[PDB]
């Protein structure tokens, strides 16, 4: 019921699953880039571009640009370009590190 801002290019999207959070990054026109299996068992993920509404399904999402107050994000074009260029690549909390890398350029604490 709370009015909220719509996602902007490069925004971090956190989806509240039953039990845990799924992260994605907004790339425009309703789409996000995120990881999917190619849990603690899966050692490979594939980068996918999908509709936010499909990823979220019946779960709500929120924008959570969590580190912005301490660390300046990269310009949105750099965020989006790098997210898009990774689509289809296989890569070895993991989702959160992925999206932080893209938004900020760094992901280590």
Curated annotation (Swiss-Prot):
Enzyme Commission number(s) from the entry: 2.3.1.-, 3.1.1.32, 3.1.1.4
Active site per UniProt: 22, 34, 95 (acyl-thioester intermediate)
Catalysed reaction, written as an equation: a 1,2-diacyl-sn-glycero-3-phosphocholine + H2O = a 1-acyl-sn-glycero-3-phosphocholine + a fatty acid + H(+); a 1,2-diacyl-sn-glycero-3-phosphocholine + H2O = a 2-acyl-sn-glycero-3-phosphocholine + a fatty acid + H(+); a 1,2-diacyl-sn-glycero-3-phosphoethanolamine + a 1,2-diacyl-sn-glycero-3-phosphocholine = an N-acyl-1,2-diacyl-sn-glycero-3-phosphoethanolamine + a 1-acyl-sn-glycero-3-phosphocholine + H(+); a 1,2-diacyl-sn-glycero-3-phosphoethanolamine + a 1,2-diacyl-sn-glycero-3-phosphocholine = an N-acyl-1,2-diacyl-sn-glycero-3-phosphoethanolamine + a 2-acyl-sn-glycero-3-phosphocholine + H(+)
Key words, A-Z: Acyltransferase, Cytoplasm, Hydrolase, Lipid degradation, Lipid metabolism, Membrane, Transferase, Transmembrane, Transmembrane helix
Gene Ontology BP annotations: lipid catabolic process; N-acylphosphatidylethanolamine metabolic process; phosphatidylethanolamine acyl-chain remodeling
Single GO MF descriptor: phospholipase A2 activity
Annotated membrane topology: Single-pass membrane protein
Domain LRAT: 12-109
Cellular component, GO, one term: cytosol
Comment on pH dependence: Optimum pH is 8.
Expressing tissues: Expressed in liver, kidney, small intestine testis and colon. Undetectable in testis, placenta, salivary gland and fetal brain.
Intracellular or extracellular location(s): Cytoplasm; Membrane
Main location: cytoplasm
Regions of this protein lying in the Cytoplasmic compartment: 1-109
Function statement: Exhibits both phospholipase A1/2 and acyltransferase activities. Shows phospholipase A1 (PLA1) and A2 (PLA2) activity, catalyzing the calcium-independent release of fatty acids from the sn-1 or sn-2 position of glycerophospholipids. For most substrates, PLA1 activity is much higher than PLA2 activity. Shows O-acyltransferase activity, catalyzing the transfer of a fatty acyl group from glycerophospholipid to the hydroxyl group of lysophospholipid.
Family, as annotated: Belongs to the H-rev107 family.
Name under which the protein is recorded: Phospholipase A and acyltransferase 2
Organism from which the protein derives: Homo sapiens
Taxonomic lineage of the native organism: Eukaryota, Metazoa, Chordata, Craniata, Vertebrata
Portion held of the full protein: 2 to 127 of 162
């Amino acid at each position: 019921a709370l009015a909220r801002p719509r996602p902007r290019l490069g925004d971090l999207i956190e989806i509240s699953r039953f039990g845990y959070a799924h992260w994605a990054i907004y790339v425009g026109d309703g789409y996000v880039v995120h990881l999917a299996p190619a849990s603690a068992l899966t050692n490979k993920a594939i980068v996918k571009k999908e509709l936010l509404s499909v990823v979220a399904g019946g779960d709500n999402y929120r924008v959570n640009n969590k580190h912005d107050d301490r660390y300046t994000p990269l310009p949105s074009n750099k965020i989006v370009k790098r997210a898009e260029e990774l689509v289809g690549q296989e890569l070895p909390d993991n989702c959160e590190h992925f999206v932080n890398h893209l938004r900020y350029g760094v992901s280590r604490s």
